[PDB]
A paper describes a structure:
To study the impact of inhibited actin integration on the structure of γ-TuRC, we replaced full-length GCP6 in the recombinant expression system by an N-terminally truncated form of GCP6 (ΔN56-GCP6), reconstituted γ-TuRCΔN56-GCP6 and subjected the complex to cryo-EM analysis. Surprisingly, the remaining segments of the lumenal bridge were still well-structured, allowing for detailed dissection of the MZT1-containing modules in the lumenal bridge. While the MZT1-GCP3(8) module forming the basis of the lumenal bridge was structurally identical to the wild-type complex, no cryo-EM density could be observed for the first two N-terminal GCP6 α-helices, as expected. Notably, all three α-helices of the GCP6-associated MZT1 copy were well-resolved, indicating that the first two N-terminal GCP6 α-helices are dispensable for stable folding of the MZT1-GCP6 module.
The gamma-tubulin ring complex (γ-TuRC) is the principal microtubule nucleation template in vertebrates. Microtubules are formed de novo in a process termed nucleation, which is spatially and temporally highly controlled by γ-tubulin complexes, composed of γ-tubulin1 and associated γ-tubulin-complex proteins (GCP). In most eukaryotes, microtubules are templated from a preassembled γ-tubulin ring complex (γ-TuRC) that determines the position and direction of microtubule growth.
Numbering used by the authors:
A (entry chain A): 646 to 665, 675 to 768, 814 to 844, 851 to 867
B (entry chain n): 7 to 105
C (entry chain o): 11 to 75
D (entry chain O): 3 to 41, 45 to 93, 101 to 177, 180 to 279, 287 to 306, 313 to 447
Write the structure that this text describes.
Amino acid sequence: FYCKHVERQLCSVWISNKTAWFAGAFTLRQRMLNFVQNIQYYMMFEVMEPTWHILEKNLKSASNIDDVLGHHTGFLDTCLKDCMLTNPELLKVFSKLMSVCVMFTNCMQKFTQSLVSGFEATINKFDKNFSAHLLDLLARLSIYSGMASVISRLDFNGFYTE
Amino acid sequence: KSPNVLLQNLCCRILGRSEADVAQQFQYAVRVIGSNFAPTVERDEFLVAEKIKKELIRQRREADAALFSELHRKLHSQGVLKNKWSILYLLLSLSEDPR
Amino acid sequence: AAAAAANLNAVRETMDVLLEISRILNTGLDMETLSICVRLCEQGINPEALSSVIKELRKATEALK
Amino acid sequence: REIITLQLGQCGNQIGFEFWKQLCAEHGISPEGIVEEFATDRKDVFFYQADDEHYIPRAVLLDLEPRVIHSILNSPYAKLYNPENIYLGNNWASGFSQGEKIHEDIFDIIDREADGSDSLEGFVLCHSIAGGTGSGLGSYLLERLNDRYPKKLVQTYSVFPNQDEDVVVQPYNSLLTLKRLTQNADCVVVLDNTALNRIATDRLHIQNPSFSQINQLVSTIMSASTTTLRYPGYMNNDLIGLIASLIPTPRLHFLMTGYTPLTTDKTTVLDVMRRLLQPKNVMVSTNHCYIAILNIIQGEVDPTQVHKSLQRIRERKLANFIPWGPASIQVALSRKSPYLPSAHRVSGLMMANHTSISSLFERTCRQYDKLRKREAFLEQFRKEDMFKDNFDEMDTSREIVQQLIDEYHAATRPDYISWG
């Protein structure tokens, strides 16, 4: 739900910002929306749907209830644990990046004038804060023990590789 | 307009002069055109076309006599001229023989 | 309009094709005069009457010279 | 949310007619609108739940010299959509001026249907570029829509005017319309008439009825693109999410069309991915590199197949990359529609932002530059003279399309901190 809320914010910025100032936030917004959409594509189409379709094969071929109970518990436990939910240190950089997202969209919605430099400076401050944490996410996930799938989803060109 | 002042235009077009410079020639125009406004002779465009071809054979511009076969067709193709006969008789009447 | 100028195209065409007919019979009328000569014929007029006037006006531009 | 579809011109009403017939056959409705017994879906995206138990689509019917629109009138699909708003050529200036003098009541027609639906997501314009009937009026209405409503989306399904063609004012008309498209639209979907013509003369041996078969193609593409909105997924159940990833900046908003079967008249995701990435399964036919691709697939998809297919697409490198960033082909999965013919059970389509369309733009610019240098092909159209006696709008449109070509070439560079 938090990940959907920020998607709404990020699309709102692009549609309002087009008036019929700067391109510094264009590339920053292109790195935020194409981040959060891909966490959804991964988190669903690798964890949720495969195991759910196998769990429909567990609800045709299993003859008792104490199999089905364990199968269900395993699907829930993996759908948390293979993500950022009950990770032991949570990968706290995700909350920090989402905080930089919500601050960026809040400032970018006030693109209406009636200083362009003050907006440009706070957007670049956010750009440093964001780009550092995106590289920190890629590093912190790469060391943690499936990696290459979400890494290749997040960057494919290798414009950043760390 | 009226045809009487439009004939004065013709008298400015053939000559190279203003209309207050000469009034004699426009008086010749109004004396000949006047008391006649309607042809009292045979009316057919087809006969005057057969009189233009007959005239171009007599002058040995017989390739131009096959041009007139196309130009009369073009004249029919536009179709915005009320009397095709009067201008063909008029253009036939002023014909010179350079041979 | 647009078609109301297409009729103006079809009149300039009439005027040009009658000039080709004018040169192959070798008359002295040019384009500007021929545009008067077609206008007169729409009301209807004797070419037998007009030819003598034109054959006098071409005989009165070198005699009034 | 809800989409209100606008159709205008003979070609635009043709493609809207075939698209509405396609969605009528697709969803569980009669040509009157009578509900079926087989219909995770939605019937509120193009359709209003209208007030005689017919899901009447919200369509603006515009006619200008109607010939085929009369055939649309006496038709069984005139019982599906007719909110009774039909209100009355061969030039951009004529259609522009005619749209200018009557903008009020057609804007009231737009206001009526805008009040008709509860929510709104965008305006999809059935448009033909330099189609004569669609041209001019479409550009003027594009100005009216983007000026009057700045909070919504504007989509324009557009053809590229090359039909192996006589009209010599067509580069001027397409240039002025393209100026309006770059400046007054949020996103433009462009197709090539010659590409679809080549594909149609390939798959069959038809030469004369090319128009109607091209209509089948664009209607199938338009249904395929909005399947993810019409059927509830997880993303691109609104237009702006699909519009967002492909468009990196307000100037590059022109999208190529792909769809991996050219056939509907066994298969896996892996094969159709590698079959999609060639430029001859693209229905739009130096370094040329995509900005961003997005593919949507619909079928009996094993979820491991998209995973290892995207693996193969990476290490093969069969797609053109983006220098200044990551923005790549994204796998989207959608539901197979009820009552669609069972050929190519796994079927995908793609929408992509490519710099190769700059070549087609500069070709048409070169045609305009040739006819403009010769100065014998304006034909002295009276509406063109009275609209602009100085013809400075052609110069302004040329400047805008030149800036567009420069921004395309600048996005091609590894630096896009250099602009145009």
